[PDB]
Chain A
Amino acid sequence: GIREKIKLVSSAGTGHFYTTTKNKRTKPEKLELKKFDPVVRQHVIYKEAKIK
Chain B
Amino acid sequence: GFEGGQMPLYRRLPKFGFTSRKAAITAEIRLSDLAKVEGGVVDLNTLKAANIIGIQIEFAKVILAGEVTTPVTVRGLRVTKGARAAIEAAGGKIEE
Q: Do chains A and B touch in the complex (CB under 8 A)?
A: no
A interface residues with partner B (beta carbon < 8 Å): none
B interface residues with partner A (beta carbon < 8 Å): none
